[PDB]
Structure formats: C-alpha cells, structure tokens
C-alpha cells in the first residue's frame, strides 16, 4: 500500500495567475507498459470526479491546454497555466502504480477576489418551532471573501458557545464568494428567560465586528 | 455517449448488506475496466474495487472479504455487494470506466450514497425564517427556511417550485447527533414580499415527506 501526499491542502490563486499542485508518492512510481501511472482529477462543486491528466503528462480529450503534467519518481506536478474561474473545485492526484491505486487528499484551488464583507442577516425562532419547544435562532452571512470568519453568539450581552451549528457553502463560480450559515440552538424555555440575541461577525475587512440582532419581546 | 448511473445507496444498520447498481450504456460493456470508488465526508477518494474484462476482481484492504463486485454482462449493469457493512463505509460511492486498459477512471455517475447507522429515518421538521419587522428596510430582504431533525441524507429545497432561483443560498447539512440540519437562504426586492408570495419546497426522499412552508412576515399583530 503506497501513500500519496498531496499539498497544498488550499491553493488560492488571483485569474489570470498560474496554479501550481504537487504530489510525492512515499514510493518510486511502478511504470505500467512504460508509462507512468499518474493521474490528476478535478472535481467541480455538485459534480462528479472528472479526469485531466494521466500518464502523468497527457490530456484526456476536451480538456484545455492551459493544464499541463509533469514530474517524476514520486514528484508530479499538476500546473493551470492561467487560471479562469470555471477551474475552481477540488484537484485529486492518482497514483496506480500497485494495487490498491491511491487518490492524494486533494486541493481545494480557491479563486482570489477582492476582499468583500458578508450581508448579515439574523432571524428569531419561529412560532411552529416555539410551539414543539425548541428555538434556533439563524443567522446568514452571505457573499463575502475571504473565508476565515469569525461568528459569536451574544445572548443579553453574554457569549454562547454550546448549541452552535456553522456551516458554509463551496465557493460560487459565478462572484468567487463564499456563503455561510450559524444556528444557535436552545431551549424554548430559555429563549423565553433571555431579550437581547446576536451573532456578531468578525472578518479580515474590518477590526469592526459586523452586529446583527433582536429582542425576544418585539417586532 | 457514454454513461454510468448509480443506484441502491440507502440507510443501512451496521453488519447489514447492500447491494449496489451501475447502469452502463454507449459502449462495449464486457471490454472495459470497471470500477467502484468512494467518497467520504472529508471528500477524500478511496478505490474500492475493480473488475477488468478478463473477470479478474480486486480489492481495498478495508473491502476485502465483505464486498463483492460482478457484472451481468448482459444486462450492461455493474454491481457492488457488501456485507458487514460498518460505520467506516458511508460514502458516497460511483462508479467509473477506464478509459483504456488499466488508464483512468472516465464518466463517473452521479453516485448513490450509503449511510451506515443505527440512527433511524426521521422526517425533517421545516421552519420558515422571516425578518424582524420592517424598520430595517433596503430594497432587498433576505428570507430562509431552516430544515432540521431528519435523517438520513439527503433532502432536497426549492424555492416557489423552482420559480424562485436566483439569489439562493442552501447550506450542507451538518450532522449533530443522529439528526441533520440545514438551512437555505433566499434575497428579494424588499418591495415584492410579502406581496407576493415566498414559499420553500422541502422533501427528503427516505421519509417520502414533501413540505412547503410560506415565509410569513413575523406576527406583530
Ligand atoms: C481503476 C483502473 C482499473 C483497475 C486497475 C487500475 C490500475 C492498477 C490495477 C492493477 C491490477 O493488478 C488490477 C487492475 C487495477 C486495480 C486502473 C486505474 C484506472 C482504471 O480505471
């Protein structure tokens, strides 16, 4: 059983700039009928797996000749001469020299935009959930870059650690921005104890936490 | 064309077995590799079997002795049987031709998936996600619907039956504790809601349950 490693596990890259993946095999490539057995895959977000290169160095057809393999003896190198948006998705590099083959852990390649911070957006509990005793309170912070966020949950100005779910959307191809969604679960009777709810966003673009929030008791 | 189409995937109770499909079409089904791959939670992709023409199969360590893949050559379908299933095995698995002899893995399904749990079917509990007030008013608004509480994947939402499909935002469901959870945002001009109506479709296929839930203007009296 050979191991493939591959890095980076993020590779950002601004379009028009050059994409650069790698991958060492802990052990020399087993050339098959001469060849070598390597492989590079791109799985694009909702889409299946799809194959670019193979044989380390050939291009499965219909795919554009900005993308390019190389390498050799457990290094290769898959390279994206000048990124454009649609190659935005997760890069996996195959190893088959022995059974079993093996996939690298993969590259999320990340579109470089301009900074940008998210819309926030909070919401109360429904009635339907209140009346079965639960209360989640959501919060949407959308289309923003980078993706390193930080959400705090406030409750009467104390912050609420357990009960949080986070979770973020892959990157949009269309405005190379990032989604994510915070639900902070409690109890109906303590949601009922408390006022004041917020979640308050920290984001690179500003040392100024974004706040959203409501009081339990109004409209 | 080509085409491989999964089918099969579904809850399963640890040790239990499941018998996977691929429907293959657009060429010589009997004269290529074909093979099983899956995808876990971390996206990593893990081979799990091969059959080449000459009937020979192989295996993963973590498969060997519990799957068994086979085709019907006549049916043009390719299978995947497993027993002893185990937590370890949820994924979603596809299936895939090479593209000439032992040369890579081409026209990959969309995959069916397999959940391995002890964890029941629960139906999905959907609240609707309206704004606080009015005061607080641009020309957009941003409305959502919160799914949470069923099991298994997956489910699926919609908005205005499809009518609705731009400026949506549905989040991966995220699993705490036997019961998933996900959430699906939606931005309108501030001046067609709640005018016009906005509605979220929601239906998860494991408990045959189809919910449509209007966003309703918070009550206010
Ligand atoms: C999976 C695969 C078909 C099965 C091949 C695999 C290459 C390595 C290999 C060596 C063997 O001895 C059996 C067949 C297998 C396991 C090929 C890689 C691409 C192709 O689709």
């Known amino acids: 059983d050979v191991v493939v490693t591959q890095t980076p596990l993020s590779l950002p890259v601004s379009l028009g700039d050059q994409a650069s993946i790698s991958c060492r095999s802990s052990?020399?490539?087993?050339?098959?009928?001469?060849?070598?057995?390597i492989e590079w895959y791109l799985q694009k977000p909702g889409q299946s797996p799809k194959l670019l290169i193979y044989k380390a160095y050939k291009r499965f057809p219909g795919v554009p000749d900005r993308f390019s393999g190389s390498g050799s003896g457990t290094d290769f190198t898959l390279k994206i001469s000048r990124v454009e948006a649609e190659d935005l998705g997760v890069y996996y590099c195959?190893?088959?020299?022995?059974?079993?083959?093996?996939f690298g852990g993969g590259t999320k390649l990340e579109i470089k935009r301009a900074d940008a911070a998210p819309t926030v957006s909070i919401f109360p509990p429904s009635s339907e959930q209140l009346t079965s005793g639960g209360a989640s309170v959501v919060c949407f912070l959308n289309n923003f870059y980078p993706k390193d966020i930080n959400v705090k949950w406030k409750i009467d100005g104390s912050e609420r650690q357990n009960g949080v779910l986070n979770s973020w959307t892959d990157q949009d191809s269309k405005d190379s921005t990032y989604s994510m969604s915070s639900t902070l679960t409690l109890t109906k009777d303590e949601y009922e104890r408390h006022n004041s709810y917020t979640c308050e966003a920290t984001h690179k673009t500003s040392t100024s936490p974004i706040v959203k929030s409501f009081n339990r008791d109004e409209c | 064309e080509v085409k491989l189409v999964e089918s099969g995937g579904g809850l399963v109770k640890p040790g239990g077995s499941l018998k996977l499909s691929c429907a293959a079409s657009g060429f010589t089904f009997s004269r290529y590799a074909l093979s099983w791959v899956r995808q876990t939670a971390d996206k990593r992709l893990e081979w799990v079997a091969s059959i080449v023409s000459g009937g020979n199969t192989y295996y993963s360590g973590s498969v060997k002795g519990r799957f068994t893949i086979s085709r019907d050559i006549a049916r043009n379908i390719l299978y995947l049987q497993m027993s002893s299933l185990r937590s370890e095995d949820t994924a979603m698995y596809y299936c895939?031709?090479?593209?000439?002899?032992?040369?890579?893995?081409?026209?990959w399904g969309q995959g069916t998936l397999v959940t391995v749990s002890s964890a029941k079917t629960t139906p999905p509990s959907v609240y609707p996600l309206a704004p606080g007030s009015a005061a607080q008013t641009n020309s957009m608004v941003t409305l959502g619907c919160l799914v949470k509480g069923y099991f298994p994947e997956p489910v699926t939402v919609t908005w205005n039956s499809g009518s609705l499909s731009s400026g949506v935002h549905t989040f991966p469901a995220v699993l705490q504790s036997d019961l998933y959870t996900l959430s699906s945002s939606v931005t309108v001009p501030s001046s067609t809601w709640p005018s016009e109506t906005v509605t979220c479709n929601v239906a998860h296929p494991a408990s045959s349950t189809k919910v449509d839930k209007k966003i309703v203007p918070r009550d206010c009296g």
């Open positions: 895939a031709r090479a593209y000439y002899g032992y040369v890579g893995l081409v026209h």
């Open positions: 195959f190893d088959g020299s022995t059974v079993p083959p093996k």
């Open positions: 052990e020399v490539i087993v050339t098959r009928n001469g060849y070598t057995p």
